[PDB]
Description:
Elements: no helix or strand
Family: Belongs to the protease inhibitor I7 (squash-type serine protease inhibitor) family.
Function: Inhibits trypsin.
Subcellular location: Secreted
Amino acid sequence: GCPRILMRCKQDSDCLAGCVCGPNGFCG
């Protein structure tokens, strides 16, 4: 699943494995 590290994004392709780009502009 998605790791517990913070990451900024504009789409899910910016995020780590199993993560999504949420509406706050960060991965989870």
